[PDB]
Design an enzyme around this catalytic site. Sequence first.
Site, short mmCIF file in Angstrom:
data_model
loop_
_atom_site.label_atom_id
_atom_site.label_comp_id
_atom_site.label_asym_id
_atom_site.label_seq_id
_atom_site.Cartn_x
_atom_site.Cartn_y
_atom_site.Cartn_z
N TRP A 197 0.78 -1.43 0.06
CA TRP A 197 -0.17 -0.10 -0.11
C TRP A 197 0.95 1.24 0.11
CZ3 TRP A 197 -1.25 3.02 4.73
CH2 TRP A 197 -2.24 3.83 4.43
N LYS A 219 -13.50 0.28 5.77
CA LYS A 219 -13.77 -0.72 4.72
C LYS A 219 -14.80 -1.52 5.33
CE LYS A 219 -9.61 0.50 3.13
NZ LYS A 219 -7.96 0.36 3.32
N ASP A 231 -0.98 -4.62 9.71
CA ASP A 231 -1.67 -3.68 9.17
C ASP A 231 -3.03 -4.51 8.81
OD1 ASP A 231 -3.36 -2.03 7.60
OD2 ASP A 231 -1.55 -1.28 6.36
#
Lengths: 412, 412
Positions: free
Chosen positions: A140, A258, A222
């Site tokens: 990312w 999300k 993460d």
Amino acid sequence: APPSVFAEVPQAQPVLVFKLIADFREDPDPRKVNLGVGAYRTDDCQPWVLPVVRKVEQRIANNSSLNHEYLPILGLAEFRTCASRLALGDDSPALQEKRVGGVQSLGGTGALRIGAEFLARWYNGTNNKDTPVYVSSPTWENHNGVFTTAGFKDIRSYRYWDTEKRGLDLQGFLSDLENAPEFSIFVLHACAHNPTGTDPTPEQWKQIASVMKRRFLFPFFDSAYQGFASGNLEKDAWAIRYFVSEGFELFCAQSFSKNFGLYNERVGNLTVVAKEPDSILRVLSQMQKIVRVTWSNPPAQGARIVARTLSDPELFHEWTGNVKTMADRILSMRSELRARLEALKTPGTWNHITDQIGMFSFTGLNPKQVEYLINQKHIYLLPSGRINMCGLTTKNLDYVATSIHEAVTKIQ
Amino acid sequence: APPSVFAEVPQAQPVLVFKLIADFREDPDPRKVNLGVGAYRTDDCQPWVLPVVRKVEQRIANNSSLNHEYLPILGLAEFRTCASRLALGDDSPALQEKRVGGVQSLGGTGALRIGAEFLARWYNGTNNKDTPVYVSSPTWENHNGVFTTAGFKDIRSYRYWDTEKRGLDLQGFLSDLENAPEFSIFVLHACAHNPTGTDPTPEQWKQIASVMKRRFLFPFFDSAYQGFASGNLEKDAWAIRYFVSEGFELFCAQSFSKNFGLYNERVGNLTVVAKEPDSILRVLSQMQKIVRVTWSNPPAQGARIVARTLSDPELFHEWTGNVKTMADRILSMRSELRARLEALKTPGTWNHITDQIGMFSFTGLNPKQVEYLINQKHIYLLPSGRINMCGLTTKNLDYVATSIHEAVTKIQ
């Protein structure tokens, strides 16, 4: 006259995705498909506010007991507790032994930032900015930036995506772990690797964990897609829980952007797992000083929604259903795309489309192939071959599959 | 027997503020008064959710058209525009000339932080951490912390509060300005100086501006009490507007925590004023990079409430009345305390109580006298002699005045 104090400030280079999206927007072609989107989208190409979220927002609005007084620096206690419990599981040995702390943060980004700032000051000595930080290849976009800004001087990459095999380069990953200086920090994606969609299997995780344990490598997880990834909250947190089980100390940056669809409410949590309970108090005391000078204290709205949902069995149950809906739509688009590509006898193997997990997929398309899709087919994706499965719908699937088939057979 | 990686993390030292509230909370004593509070309170000692805020929140909650998709990195356009216009005035030349930019941030703290990080990178050269940063003596405690964290190595103080005169040490301040190296950054409180409540008059501001202009000192305004301070939004932004009119380039960190009572929604804005329009684009481009790595993008709730209020003439009007209500209660407490202290024929001059503006008042009490008020009267305030006027009510007003008379008389 004295020139502006800003006379020599250069114009920063813009990020690719922004342009792609602008491009997409301006395209008159009725056949246009946006695979460059970075969030969940329904079969009708719309954003989706989770039904449980709307329900909770109404309850909040009607709750007269609520005020707007500052939250504690570390955040809303109920949120911190619920968030950590979601990641680790109610029965976690670490929770039971009281060796867990949680810091409410500004999304998964804020959690990573706070964690990186802590490490740059108190880990592997004092103010040690030389500890190597390893990120996956690729990762990312913001990983590097967060760590660089926290002051880390030596940012490295570990082998991960294997271009030829269209899967995980386990041997490469393990060699990078083996060669990493003791105490190096490893940023690990808990599940739904972004941007590839390729994750280690539990068995591979065990191999990874073995090397980390032995070389004293620090796991900085993460976790932005728990539950969103497979529809199963427990399965999605397997790797984090395994590391805990194996006795690691770790950080886990959690995002609710999300899985709650609360992108714009910036709800995150930094979970910290230590060897001993007393350490938690000391660590959090230091986290407070970092927060104070960054955002002072966190916002309430997002955290109140999450805390309300996770602490009410009826709401919780409803949320798990909403999450499953998202996960199921993604599974569906993956199976459908693959099926179509295979029906068209498209050259190569496409099992990666269904082996990958989450919203994002590294298709294996090359840049030339990407150019053709955009330019000729009005199908927007990144030069990396990364697509967002949510850009696919029951209505554009044929178009996309056929266009990919053309790109692959006609472009080299 | 591998030791914890957190073994040597020290316990951070606690914040006095925090200690006091806590102390106060535990006080069994029925007469106890908390003048240590740092937010608005009614005459009943309750937090106050502004009526207009409740109204807009209901409107937001029922607006089926809103989604939770990420805001742009710099924030909600409408909020940025409205927030900047509030500080500068609708008729500001800078606005007409399009040489103003706004960055939505995490409260006034977040605005200061982004601003400091920008200066540490692009002002007075590139990556110049040696430019002196000047803060008032005394100031809002987080000022040092934010600038230190941003990397500035030389943080200086400018004379401000005169203990003897119980007012502004203008000559001290001016000498400090005259002696500051060219290009030094000055952190200025726009109005309602925290923690003194002592502000320069417009004529004093003109003398300050004169020196700054001559020596090319950079004005970094901290505007946390616009409107809240005097009850009038226009009066309270005068200093900022004057500097704009004098052709200064400046930063203005705005907080909506107090004037909207949205403490826990973390709504702030960084207004940037440049010499020319082109610079703004370049500066904002750099700001995006800084935000991206800190919080990614800002939360929506708070900003939406503010934007809706400021853009609707009816709501705006209602809001101005709510603000005046808060300001009026404070003015009333100031007038009353002064009056009682004088009727009591308390030694020393007390006009400062009335000359001061905002929530905070430096009473002039020594720590010796404070010690007493806490120990003996159960009246909680900082050793600095700072009080929050919102801690006073029609009901404790006499007790306090009485107790102050004794303090000043019994102890010395």
